Amino acid sequence: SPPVVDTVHGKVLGKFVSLEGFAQPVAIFLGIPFAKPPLGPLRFTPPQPAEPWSFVKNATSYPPMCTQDPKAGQLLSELFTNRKENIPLKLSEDCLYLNIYTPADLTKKNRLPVMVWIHGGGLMVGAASTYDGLALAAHENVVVVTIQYRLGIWGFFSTGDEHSRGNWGHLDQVAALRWVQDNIASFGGNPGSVTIFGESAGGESVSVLVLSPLAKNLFHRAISESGVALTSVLVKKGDVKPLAEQIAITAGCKTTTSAVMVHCLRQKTEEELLETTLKMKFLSLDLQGDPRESQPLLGTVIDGMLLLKTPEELQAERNFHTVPYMVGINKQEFGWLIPMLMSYPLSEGQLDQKTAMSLLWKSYPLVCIAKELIPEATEKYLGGTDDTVKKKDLFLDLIADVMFGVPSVIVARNHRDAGAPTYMYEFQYRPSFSSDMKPKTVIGDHGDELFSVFGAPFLKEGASEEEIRLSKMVMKFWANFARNGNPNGEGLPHWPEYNQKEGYLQIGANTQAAQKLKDKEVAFWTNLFAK
Amino acid sequence: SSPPVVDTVHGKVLGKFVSLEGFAQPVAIFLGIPFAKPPLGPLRFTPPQPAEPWSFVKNATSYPPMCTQDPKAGQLLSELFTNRKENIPLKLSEDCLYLNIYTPADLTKKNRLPVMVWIHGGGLMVGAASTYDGLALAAHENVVVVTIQYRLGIWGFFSTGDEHSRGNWGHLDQVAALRWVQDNIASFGGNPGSVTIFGESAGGESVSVLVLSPLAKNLFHRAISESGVALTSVLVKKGDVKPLAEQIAITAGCKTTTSAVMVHCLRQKTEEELLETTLKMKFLSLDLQGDPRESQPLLGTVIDGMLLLKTPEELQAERNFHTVPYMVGINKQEFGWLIPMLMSYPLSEGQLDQKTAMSLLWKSYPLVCIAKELIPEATEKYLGGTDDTVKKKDLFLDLIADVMFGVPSVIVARNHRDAGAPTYMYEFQYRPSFSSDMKPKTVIGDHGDELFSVFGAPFLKEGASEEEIRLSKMVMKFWANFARNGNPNGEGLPHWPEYNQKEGYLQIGANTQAAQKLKDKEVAFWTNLFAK
Amino acid sequence: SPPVVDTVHGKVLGKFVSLEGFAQPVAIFLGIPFAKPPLGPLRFTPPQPAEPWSFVKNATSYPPMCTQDPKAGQLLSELFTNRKENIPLKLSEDCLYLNIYTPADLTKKNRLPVMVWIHGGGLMVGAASTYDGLALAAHENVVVVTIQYRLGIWGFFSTGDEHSRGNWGHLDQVAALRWVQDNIASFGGNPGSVTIFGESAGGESVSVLVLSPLAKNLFHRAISESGVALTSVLVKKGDVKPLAEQIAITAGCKTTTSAVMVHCLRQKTEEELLETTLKMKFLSLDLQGDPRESQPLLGTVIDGMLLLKTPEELQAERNFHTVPYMVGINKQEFGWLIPMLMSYPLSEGQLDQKTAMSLLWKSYPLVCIAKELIPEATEKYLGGTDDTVKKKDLFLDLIADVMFGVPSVIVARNHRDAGAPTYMYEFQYRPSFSSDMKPKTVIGDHGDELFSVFGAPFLKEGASEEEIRLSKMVMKFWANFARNGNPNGEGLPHWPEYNQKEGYLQIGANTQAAQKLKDKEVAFWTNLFAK
Ligand SMILES: *[C@@H]1O[C@H](CO)[C@@H](O[C@H]2O[C@H](CO)[C@@H](O)[C@H](O)[C@H]2NC(C)=O)[C@H](O)[C@H]1NC(C)=O
Ligand SMILES: CC(=O)N[C@H]1[C@H]([C@H](O)[C@H](O)CO)O[C@@](O)(C(=O)O)C[C@@H]1O
Ligand SMILES: Nc1c2c(nc3ccccc13)CCCC2
Ligand SMILES: Nc1c2c(nc3ccccc13)CCCC2
Ligand SMILES: Nc1c2c(nc3ccccc13)CCCC2
Ligand SMILES: *[C@@H]1O[C@H](CO)[C@@H](O)[C@H](O)[C@H]1NC(C)=O
Ligand SMILES: *[C@@H]1O[C@H](CO)[C@@H](O)[C@H](O)[C@H]1NC(C)=O
């Protein structure tokens, strides 16, 4: 009969789902509320605990995804899902739910490691239901939890002061982790061993939680995939008041004071805030006016609750409570996916430096390179050869290194020097699940590792023995890390720890260890930004 | 100093004098003259009506607003296509049926200069007349330049397929502006007996549409279509238009019970709600999700029974159209950069394998209409010649350009010629210094590049080489000679052969010379392919 | 291939439908517009000519029915339709359409008689699509046309002055008759021979058209089935201003002036006017307050365009169209359907005079019998027996006679005395198509003749031979009347003309002639109301 688990707030009914090659059916619970719906006065406020229910709550239907651009959200889900057919999702402000995939025999007593997944999507789009934890759970014997949190205006609107601090979405992630602590034992998970992992904005969220005192003791291991707190495009520094006013004005609100803007925005309907979102044209590279004034995403701010100061300052603090941390990147972070989703103005296979400099300046919101420095940056990367074809490839490497490569290594180095176990990787592989619109030459594009991590080869059809093995290896590395804070194990290539030798693992068709990931790039960019 | 005051049928207008270096007679410029009644309220989705007469003098010296459209796309396109020094920021408004006049004539005396009426492009969804400054062309060639505006998007082309909302309101506005020219241009030193209509892209398709429409009879005497004709499928809705109409009404929160209900409901919506609906439909952007055959890139021309009695193809099969001198042209790389960029094509890698190419070509259905079964043959034909992946990408862009512009342009020219009318063709291949900085140096003759020569950008903007200056002078000469005689030829200019059975055409660029049989093989390949 | 006809405003495409045993198929055209949609500023104004269309208009789907109580309209359509299955109809203010059923060979030239049907429904509900003309058209070789007209508030709102005269629905009826004159020949119809017929409110409409100068030359024969201009409830006499104001107030409008009330009601959405309609509780007997103040329906008024004076004044003046006129009633007009639809308070097979008197006073809006006269009226109908079962039956008769019986005979008499051919009938048969909720004892209830007139026995599945025989005879009489202004013909029982002998036909399983229909009832009520 259907699995029924008892949680703090009430009973929940899930369903059993078997996976070829496993005798123990996985118990799946969809749409479990971990907080009170952020509706009405609750919009733009920290999450409150869910209210208890009387009988058995049916947890067998996908929850709606947080309000976001429905077309961009659906496209993204289609490109990222590990399941056979993408699941159409409904939109709603009532989205603070989480899905659980437990391989534990609930009739007995278990304490399996827990892996909490934080999806990406620039903090503007995305959903938990996009990711099916069936394969990872069944193959690695771990409890997989996929959570949701407020996005866009709903999750990050900030006036820069106490009337709307911001980071609601991040507070939601924290609320989910607190929920896991109080309830995961009932699903056969060990609250004493929770690993948080995510990619892109999800990786940046994990990185933020790692530096936050609010998340202390809510997790014991962390994994950031293609995204950290130093990925400047997701973190807003300085005064955020101007942005708040641009949003309120576009929404048809007065900007008399912070309290007035917030109060007015709380009165707007979901559709009105969604229409405001579309007018702001987020997720897109603005090619008009001054690049310095364009804000393609609404993200993390230094609110004073979640983050006491900038991530750059919080890293140097060699004494906070640490946890094993794995930080990785993909070979071509800006190879296709991101540029495509941002309508990046690149269509020619040949790029000249004059144009490169123009594009880089227009890319200010993503790279933050002062106009006076564009020449140096461009010359450093493109002055290499006289092949304009190779020049555009190097240009894509430049964006990638600034957005993910250098930030990741800098975070890893600081985590290491803080005395905590650190691991790094570089993923280079072109999955068969890639979009038909993605050139075959792109290898290790943003998000390419997700298919291996969530066992797509075991849910989706068609996959070479090589792709299947790669997924088994990756899931093993990730689950081993979940269990012991060390990815190593028998039958797996050796993954050196990221110490002073800066060893890291190159993951792909052929997997081996290497040293000094992005060494020269970090040196160059650190000196450039120093100016 | 003393501003020029002209007497129009509806009242007096006051303009301003502007001097262009190299000419004694200052050009009299009149901005924002209304040629129709503001299409507000119950007038939305109906034919344009005559402007109301006014007393005293109407000050015509401020740019009029551009018709309601995506403000970000509208403004960006304006910056990319303007020929003046600084782009003029424009206001949005449903009250947009205005035109600007640039007359080089001496209004104190009598003048009958040839008149050139410009119709801007922008997929019938965006654009403005003010983007194009007629000062240079007017002074340099002694012609009266008129830039007109017309309703765009929902306001200009919403159609229910029946009598409740036939559609083509934007084209009816173009007709009304031409009618205003006939009745008023003489007062500005123009000759209503010699009116030339020219436009680029959607503007070119409009010109082509006017050539095939009974409503435009005796309104123009010469025509020029630049990069766009009535056979550019994407702009001409063929088949049942009801589905698109219902989808627009639904998005606007309207019931679809009957056509009259849809129309009545949309008429009650505010300008902002319709603009929000427009932004939600996400027009002029490649939809990468779902079935490509359901994507609706834009709202456009329909066979309404008033403007167009039947499809363009049928109208030309039978020589049923205005046999005025016609110049049809294209640029070397129509889909080179500007359009793929504005439509958000996924070409960040700049390279492309055949499998990826067939995938995008299929997603490009709304633009090219190539059945999935035919994609392999179409792709093999263009990319199979080389193994280089970057080159393949270049050939892929040529393939899309040939289908949207190249082939349609030649087919139209041939039908116009075979109808015994004077026909001319050209292929523009040059990269202006006024190109966007984000546009690589390898893109030459991209969509819109010829506009800078036609409107004398080298004489209004700065940094033009002597070669570019010489090109613009030659092009304006050709265009104005054509406007004057229906033949572009003149002393001092390369010989431009007429597009007859020999199919001669002019290659315009750094090197300007006559050639023959433009896109001959391509027309043959595609005419056969589309026949299954 | 499909039938394509050329009409003044353009081409229309219909469809061929064959009837078992008929060689030539019937051409059917559904939803042809005969006027411009009465939307926006056209609400509460006379109908305007329809705009022409350019190609071929597809007229093969049923048009919507004019806005009205959706629950009530659907129920009524289901009870009256002659089709095998009732068609669900959509609501819309855009409802000025008509359906055509022509048995003619369109490839030739035909001049078949035309019968224009005006549906009933108290001028508050109803639809043309409820009535299928296939059978009547094929069996009698006549062109059948079913029309629609504005209903309720949209069709009859009147301020009592020039700012909103009222009777928009009747003007819509005139517009359709005008369209028939200009276009019917194209459908094989003869504009020189048009017969208008309807039942209930449609019967009253036909009666009003006979008295209106606006309809001269639009028809040549008329048939009123259970309803005439003397059926008081459908005709507003006196000052209509108070009702106008009550509707305005219910809709949230000010009543400062007529123009202000009209202008305000024009800005209301269809839904708002429908909600106002529901709050008014039309088509329902009000059991609260003074019976004299309740208005169960919005109807005809003496506007000065359609009607220049009350029917009574126009009859005395002998000022009207002297076309052949057939006027009939059913045995039990208030037998079940109407009392049921009005939520009439009667659930006992027995009724005492005291209760009867209270009910009759409550029925004021339907009968207009002053309270001081209630005793005499009641004593005259019930006082003859002690059987309280027979008393309630007699109570229903009294309502029926006052609403239909007497008014019909008086109208027949005035028409006869005006020198025009007149015929009367009394229908007494219980169709097998009656509702399952209608007691078997009710015979000749309101609307029962409709199934015979429209040939339900030929469209519905398996009707008894007796019922089939009755319908063939009725359609025969109706069609002979249509072509000759005299129903008589070969093989049909003799139907005497309604002259000084006052002969009329008793239609039923046994059809025979009789004399002096409701003669004593008319004498009684005429004397009573004269007080
Ligand atoms: C005319 O309209 C009808 C109804 O819209 C079309 O009929 C087809 O679709 C209807 C259901 O959506 C059905 O009622 C019809 O039975 C169905 N069959 C056909 C094709 O007749 C019809 O195609 C239209 N014809 C024209 C000339 O457009
Ligand atoms: C919306 C509108 O009508 N603006 C018009 C303005 C106003 O008339 C003036 O600013 C006076 O208010 O001036 C013009 O006519 C003009 O000078 O050419 C252009 C423009 O169309
Ligand atoms: N996944 C995305 C990320 C970023 N931008 C994006 C923009 C559009 C769609 C997806 C995105 C910025 C860096 C973090 C990841
Ligand atoms: N997106 C388009 C633009 C232009 N023409 C177009 C023609 C067809 C389809 C899309 C188009 C002209 C310049 C502005 C952009
Ligand atoms: N009140 C009346 C109702 C109906 N018809 C009527 C016909 C005439 C006069 C009053 C009527 C049909 C059913 C609903 C009520
Ligand atoms: C739970 O809901 C699902 C549909 O989402 C349904 O299949 C199932 O019957 C429900 N369980 C119970 C017992 O309500
Ligand atoms: C005409 O309009 C211009 C622009 O606003 C203004 O500067 C000028 O004073 C006006 N002249 C007249 C005639 O009012």
GROMACS .gro file of C-alpha atoms in nm, chain A residues 36-206:
model
  171
   36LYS     CA    1   0.333   2.921   0.503
   37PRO     CA    2   0.232   3.047   0.154
   38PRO     CA    3   0.392   3.396   0.114
   39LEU     CA    4   0.064   3.561   0.017
   40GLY     CA    5  -0.076   3.905   0.087
   41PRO     CA    6   0.102   4.079   0.375
   42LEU     CA    7   0.355   3.795   0.377
   43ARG     CA    8   0.497   3.899   0.041
   44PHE     CA    9   0.843   4.050   0.095
   45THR     CA   10   0.880   3.903   0.446
   46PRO     CA   11   1.078   3.610   0.584
   47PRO     CA   12   0.909   3.267   0.555
   48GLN     CA   13   0.681   3.152   0.836
   49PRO     CA   14   0.633   2.789   0.945
   50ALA     CA   15   0.357   2.591   0.777
   51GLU     CA   16   0.033   2.538   0.966
   52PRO     CA   17  -0.041   2.177   1.072
   53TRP     CA   18  -0.309   1.969   0.899
   54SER     CA   19  -0.560   1.725   1.044
   55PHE     CA   20  -0.558   1.403   0.841
   56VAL     CA   21  -0.343   1.260   0.565
   57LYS     CA   22  -0.212   1.514   0.315
   58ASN     CA   23  -0.190   1.370  -0.035
   59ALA     CA   24   0.165   1.439  -0.152
   60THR     CA   25   0.146   1.288  -0.501
   61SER     CA   26   0.114   1.579  -0.745
   62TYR     CA   27   0.385   1.821  -0.855
   63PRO     CA   28   0.362   2.157  -0.684
   64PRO     CA   29   0.345   2.477  -0.886
   65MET     CA   30   0.671   2.657  -0.958
   66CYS     CA   31   0.725   3.008  -0.817
   67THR     CA   32   0.592   3.292  -1.031
   68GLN     CA   33   0.832   3.357  -1.317
   69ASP     CA   34   0.833   3.419  -1.693
   70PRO     CA   35   0.637   3.108  -1.801
   71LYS     CA   36   0.812   3.072  -2.138
   72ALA     CA   37   1.167   3.108  -2.006
   73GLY     CA   38   1.085   2.880  -1.714
   74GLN     CA   39   0.946   2.609  -1.940
   75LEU     CA   40   1.234   2.632  -2.186
   76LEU     CA   41   1.486   2.604  -1.902
   77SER     CA   42   1.303   2.309  -1.748
   78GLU     CA   43   1.305   2.136  -2.087
   79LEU     CA   44   1.680   2.181  -2.129
   80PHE     CA   45   1.767   2.079  -1.773
   81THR     CA   46   1.530   1.797  -1.678
   82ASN     CA   47   1.670   1.444  -1.639
   83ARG     CA   48   1.337   1.276  -1.702
   84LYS     CA   49   1.204   1.120  -2.024
   85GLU     CA   50   0.942   1.389  -2.082
   86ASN     CA   51   0.941   1.736  -1.932
   87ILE     CA   52   0.659   1.800  -1.689
   88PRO     CA   53   0.445   2.112  -1.751
   89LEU     CA   54   0.416   2.314  -1.432
   90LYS     CA   55   0.169   2.571  -1.305
   91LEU     CA   56   0.279   2.911  -1.171
   92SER     CA   57   0.192   3.049  -0.827
   93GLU     CA   58   0.314   3.258  -0.536
   94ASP     CA   59   0.218   2.949  -0.333
   95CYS     CA   60   0.538   2.765  -0.420
   96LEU     CA   61   0.723   2.696  -0.097
   97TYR     CA   62   0.722   2.318  -0.135
   98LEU     CA   63   0.980   2.041  -0.149
   99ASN     CA   64   0.987   1.694  -0.303
  100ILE     CA   65   1.142   1.392  -0.137
  101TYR     CA   66   1.287   1.074  -0.289
  102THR     CA   67   1.374   0.821  -0.019
  103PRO     CA   68   1.514   0.471  -0.096
  104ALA     CA   69   1.486   0.374   0.270
  105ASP     CA   70   1.253   0.099   0.384
  106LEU     CA   71   1.023   0.318   0.592
  107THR     CA   72   0.889   0.019   0.787
  108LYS     CA   73   1.229   0.000   0.955
  109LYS     CA   74   1.467   0.255   1.103
  110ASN     CA   75   1.716   0.428   0.875
  111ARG     CA   76   1.953   0.723   0.885
  112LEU     CA   77   2.074   0.765   0.527
  113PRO     CA   78   2.269   1.074   0.422
  114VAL     CA   79   2.047   1.352   0.287
  115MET     CA   80   2.117   1.551  -0.026
  116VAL     CA   81   1.923   1.877  -0.060
  117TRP     CA   82   1.915   2.018  -0.415
  118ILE     CA   83   1.890   2.388  -0.489
  119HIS     CA   84   1.801   2.449  -0.854
  120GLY     CA   85   1.948   2.722  -1.072
  121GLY     CA   86   1.782   2.969  -1.307
  122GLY     CA   87   1.949   3.301  -1.226
  123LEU     CA   88   1.724   3.335  -0.921
  124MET     CA   89   1.462   3.447  -1.176
  125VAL     CA   90   1.326   3.115  -1.308
  126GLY     CA   91   1.342   2.744  -1.228
  127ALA     CA   92   1.168   2.468  -1.037
  128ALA     CA   93   1.242   2.170  -0.815
  129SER     CA   94   1.011   1.934  -1.003
  130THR     CA   95   1.239   1.968  -1.305
  131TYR     CA   96   1.480   1.736  -1.122
  132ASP     CA   97   1.384   1.374  -1.064
  133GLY     CA   98   1.579   1.224  -0.774
  134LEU     CA   99   1.474   0.864  -0.846
  135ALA     CA  100   1.803   0.743  -0.998
  136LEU     CA  101   2.037   0.914  -0.755
  137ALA     CA  102   1.836   0.794  -0.458
  138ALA     CA  103   1.803   0.433  -0.579
  139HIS     CA  104   2.163   0.403  -0.703
  140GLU     CA  105   2.341   0.574  -0.414
  141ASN     CA  106   2.114   0.490  -0.122
  142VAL     CA  107   2.066   0.851  -0.011
  143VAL     CA  108   1.758   1.062   0.057
  144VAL     CA  109   1.721   1.324  -0.216
  145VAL     CA  110   1.526   1.641  -0.141
  146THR     CA  111   1.453   1.904  -0.407
  147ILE     CA  112   1.341   2.243  -0.274
  148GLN     CA  113   1.183   2.558  -0.411
  149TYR     CA  114   1.223   2.921  -0.307
  150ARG     CA  115   1.091   3.262  -0.410
  151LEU     CA  116   1.229   3.398  -0.738
  152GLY     CA  117   1.256   3.738  -0.906
  153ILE     CA  118   1.075   4.029  -0.747
  154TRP     CA  119   0.901   3.794  -0.504
  155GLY     CA  120   1.225   3.651  -0.370
  156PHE     CA  121   1.474   3.934  -0.401
  157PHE     CA  122   1.305   4.271  -0.409
  158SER     CA  123   1.508   4.499  -0.181
  159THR     CA  124   1.480   4.866  -0.082
  160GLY     CA  125   1.818   4.845   0.088
  161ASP     CA  126   1.671   4.900   0.435
  162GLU     CA  127   1.451   4.741   0.706
  163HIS     CA  128   1.128   4.784   0.511
  164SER     CA  129   1.238   4.518   0.262
  165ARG     CA  130   1.586   4.383   0.331
  166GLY     CA  131   1.575   4.130   0.050
  167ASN     CA  132   1.704   3.774   0.011
  168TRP     CA  133   1.360   3.625   0.078
  169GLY     CA  134   1.447   3.341  -0.158
  170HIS     CA  135   1.761   3.264   0.044
  171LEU     CA  136   1.564   3.275   0.369
  172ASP     CA  137   1.331   3.021   0.208
  173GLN     CA  138   1.622   2.785   0.137
  174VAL     CA  139   1.719   2.820   0.504
  175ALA     CA  140   1.359   2.748   0.609
  176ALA     CA  141   1.368   2.429   0.400
  177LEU     CA  142   1.694   2.317   0.564
  178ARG     CA  143   1.540   2.380   0.905
  179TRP     CA  144   1.241   2.171   0.792
  180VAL     CA  145   1.474   1.889   0.690
  181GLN     CA  146   1.637   1.900   1.034
  182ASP     CA  147   1.307   1.856   1.213
  183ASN     CA  148   1.148   1.610   0.972
  184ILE     CA  149   1.390   1.412   0.758
  185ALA     CA  150   1.432   1.137   1.017
  186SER     CA  151   1.076   1.025   0.944
  187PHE     CA  152   1.173   0.963   0.583
  188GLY     CA  153   1.475   0.755   0.681
  189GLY     CA  154   1.728   1.036   0.653
  190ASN     CA  155   1.997   1.143   0.895
  191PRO     CA  156   1.944   1.504   1.011
  192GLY     CA  157   2.303   1.491   1.132
  193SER     CA  158   2.433   1.443   0.776
  194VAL     CA  159   2.278   1.688   0.529
  195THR     CA  160   2.458   1.781   0.209
  196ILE     CA  161   2.345   2.086   0.014
  197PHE     CA  162   2.418   2.102  -0.357
  198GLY     CA  163   2.309   2.315  -0.649
  199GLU     CA  164   2.424   2.456  -0.978
  200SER     CA  165   2.435   2.805  -1.126
  201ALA     CA  166   2.226   3.034  -0.907
  202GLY     CA  167   2.174   2.717  -0.704
  203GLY     CA  168   2.550   2.689  -0.664
  204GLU     CA  169   2.565   3.056  -0.565
  205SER     CA  170   2.288   2.997  -0.310
  206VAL     CA  171   2.486   2.709  -0.161
   0.00000   0.00000   0.00000
